Design a protein around this ligand. Structure first.
Ligand SMILES: [Mg+2]
Ligand SMILES: [Mg+2]
Ligand SMILES: [Mg+2]
Ligand SMILES: [Mg+2]
Ligand SMILES: [Mg+2]
Ligand SMILES: [Mg+2]
Ligand SMILES: [Mg+2]
Ligand SMILES: [Mg+2]
Ligand SMILES: [Mg+2]
Ligand SMILES: [Mg+2]
Ligand SMILES: [Mg+2]
Ligand SMILES: [Mg+2]
Ligand SMILES: [Mg+2]
Ligand SMILES: [Mg+2]
Ligand SMILES: [Mg+2]
Ligand SMILES: [Mg+2]
Ligand SMILES: [Mg+2]
Ligand SMILES: [Mg+2]
Ligand SMILES: [Mg+2]
Ligand SMILES: [Mg+2]
Ligand SMILES: [Mg+2]
Ligand SMILES: [Mg+2]
Ligand SMILES: [Mg+2]
Ligand SMILES: [Mg+2]
Ligand SMILES: [Mg+2]
Ligand SMILES: [Mg+2]
Ligand SMILES: [Mg+2]
Ligand SMILES: [Mg+2]
Ligand SMILES: [Mg+2]
Ligand SMILES: [Mg+2]
Ligand SMILES: [Mg+2]
Ligand SMILES: [Mg+2]
Ligand SMILES: [Mg+2]
Ligand SMILES: [Mg+2]
Ligand SMILES: [Mg+2]
Ligand SMILES: [Mg+2]
Ligand SMILES: [Mg+2]
Lengths: 87, 70, 101, 116
RNA sequence: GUGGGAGAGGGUGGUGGAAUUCCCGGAGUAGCGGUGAAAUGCGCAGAUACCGGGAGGAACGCCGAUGGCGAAGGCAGCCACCUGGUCCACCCGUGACGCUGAGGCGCGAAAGCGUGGGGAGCAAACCGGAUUAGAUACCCGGGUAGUCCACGCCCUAAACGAUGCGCGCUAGGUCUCUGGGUCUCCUGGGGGCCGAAGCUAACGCGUUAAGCGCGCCGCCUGGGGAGUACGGCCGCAAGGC
């Protein structure tokens, strides 16, 4: 799964300020977490095609949020990418 | 001649272990009964079913029976 | 952890030392998989609607447990290995959905 | 020689013929019969008339074994599955239950082209 | 984000009963099967019908729907695990982060191919029996590939709603699945059937547009020759674009 407080750890870690749930940072972090799980899913289970489509979708969304975040604030983008190990 | 949930009290549809109640929704043969006979709703009947099929595998309920008269 | 319910149907003809040895073994391999027993039911001798292993009846145990999910399929392979045990059904616990109420 | 008293009568009725086996309380047959058992050969095997004659046969043959009470089981559908139980009803055998047991599958086997 | 939900969405491992085939056993005789009617076939080495026991494969009756899920192909016993998509309520967070999408990459019914398993029923080819003027077919009795599993190819279809994706607008009515509500009704989100305005060659479509608009992609420009030929690319091949 992702139990609620795994969720929490990621969020109450990644917020700009307390209370922020949906800012780009936090979104990409939740995305990432979920993506990494699904990737570890299809390391076994290569035959699960539908879940995989899901992954494609997740992925494409992260890239979109990054693409934005870079266009907006490069400082914070490099912050993010460094913190998560991506792109 | 009317329906099943007519004759019954507040009872748990998700309890597979209750034969006293569940035998009521089986037919003459073990055949799970139509909605028109059980008087349930969609979600109801759909739950009842899976709960029966469980009871069945546990041995509490008939997978099938034989027809008397004929 | 999650809430599960184990059902057990074993030989109806068991004598005492025997039957509570099966019970002892079940329980042994319940604690062995890291399961915590919440509540128990023995309905005991009951009339199946079709014969299970050539036998018109069965002996009925019901346990409610909470345990590691990654185990619960092993928990089952284990309860099953036992000889006199005719069915083993482990379910996830669910809320009581009613009707007519 | 048996002296079998009460017994079990089985009517197996296909579209092509009928046949009746008669057994004892634990299920072991004593005599039997079919449309071909009596004269009938072709199609006219699965008439009802023959179903009559078949039942009758089997029950005369059972009279000879010391039979009275008979519980019926019935499998299949085809003309004079009924006529069988009617014949066999007035046979002199008191009929105790009648039952339909026709096997139906919960869907295993692909059937033959004529059957789907 | 939080809370609540429905579902044959996928993948993995277990498992249950019904039926068929076979094998062992009991009991029992002369036929069973099969069709328009028959014959081939099976049966005195004992079948068919009946009862008990085992093996093995494949598919999951009723529930089942005019139902649900999925981008499509497609998906139905029960259990557990791993996981995808989605709906409502609250109106809390970011602050235009949107739409489409040549190419690419991935999925992609069935049949087909390769290697290794498995094989009960069915069944192309095939072997027989009939019918017919003939029968190379329908109908009957057999039967191999195959159907099943694993891994790898193949990339087609009436892959059909023959209806590209998204958003905004334009009467209602009736049936329905699934959410929330002050629960007769109202309000979101699916599936249907009648119908306003309107559209349409007509049939018909009509808040699940084929209406009124905007964005973006695909595609069309007499029939036969022909999805052929030539070239290229893909494919083990079949063959595909
Ligand atoms: Mg066992
Ligand atoms: Mg005949
Ligand atoms: Mg499913
Ligand atoms: Mg599944
Ligand atoms: Mg299975
Ligand atoms: Mg069997
Ligand atoms: Mg034998
Ligand atoms: Mg002969
Ligand atoms: Mg012979
Ligand atoms: Mg011979
Ligand atoms: Mg048998
Ligand atoms: Mg075999
Ligand atoms: Mg149906
Ligand atoms: Mg889900
Ligand atoms: Mg706001
Ligand atoms: Mg704000
Ligand atoms: Mg602000
Ligand atoms: Mg797109
Ligand atoms: Mg394919
Ligand atoms: Mg195929
Ligand atoms: Mg092959
Ligand atoms: Mg065949
Ligand atoms: Mg021929
Ligand atoms: Mg044939
Ligand atoms: Mg087309
Ligand atoms: Mg257009
Ligand atoms: Mg849909
Ligand atoms: Mg609607
Ligand atoms: Mg409507
Ligand atoms: Mg209309
Ligand atoms: Mg008009
Ligand atoms: Mg529109
Ligand atoms: Mg031309
Ligand atoms: Mg072509
Ligand atoms: Mg050229
Ligand atoms: Mg060429
Ligand atoms: Mg071709």
């Amino acid at each position: 799964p992702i139990t609620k407080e795994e969720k929490q750890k990621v969020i109450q870690e990644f917020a700009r300020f307390p209370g922020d749930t949906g800012s780009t940072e936090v979104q990409v972090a939740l995305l990432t977490l979920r993506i990494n799980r699904l990737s570890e899913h299809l390391k076994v289970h290569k035959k699960d095609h539908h879940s995989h489509r899901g992954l494609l979708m997740m992925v494409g969304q992260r890239r979109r949020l990054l693409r934005y975040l870079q266009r907006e604030d490069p400082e914070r983008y490099r912050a993010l990418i460094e913190k998560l190990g991506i792109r | 001649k009317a329906k099943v949930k007519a004759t019954l009290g507040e009872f748990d549809l998700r309890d597979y272990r209750n034969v006293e109640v569940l035998k009521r929704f089986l037919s003459e043969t073990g055949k799970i009964l139509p909605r028109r006979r059980t008087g349930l709703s969609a979600k109801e009947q759909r739950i009842l079913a899976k709960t029966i099929k469980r009871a069945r595998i546990l041995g509490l309920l008939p997978f099938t029976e034989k027809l008397v008269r004929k | 952890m999650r809430r599960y319910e184990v059902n057990i149907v074993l030989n109806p003809n068991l004598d005492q030392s025997q039957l509570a040895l099966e019970k002892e073994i079940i329980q042994r391999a319940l604690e062995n998989y890291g399961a915590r027993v919440e509540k128990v039911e023995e309905l005991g001798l009951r009339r199946l609607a079709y014969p299970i292993a050539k036998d018109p009846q069965g002996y009925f145990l019901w346990y409610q447990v909470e345990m590691p999910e990654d185990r619960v399929n092993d928990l089952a392979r284990e309860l099953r290995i036992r000889d006199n045990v005719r069915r083993v059904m482990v379910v996830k616990s669910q809320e009581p959905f009613l009707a007519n109420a | 020689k048996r002296q079998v008293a009460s017994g079990r009568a089985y009517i197996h009725a296909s579209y092509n013929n009928t046949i009746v086996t008669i057994t004892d309380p634990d299920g072991n047959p004593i005599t039997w019969s079919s449309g071909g058992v009596i004269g009938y050969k072709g199609s006219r095997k699965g008439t009802p008339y023959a179903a009559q004659l078949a039942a009758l046969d089997a029950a005369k043959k059972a009279m000879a074994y010391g039979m009275q009470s008979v519980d019926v089981i019935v499998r299949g559908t085809g003309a004079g599955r009924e006529q069988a139980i009617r014949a066999l009803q007035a046979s002199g055998l008191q009929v105790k239950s009648i039952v339909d047991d026709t096997p139906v599958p919960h869907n295993g086997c692909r059937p033959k082209k004529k059957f789907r």
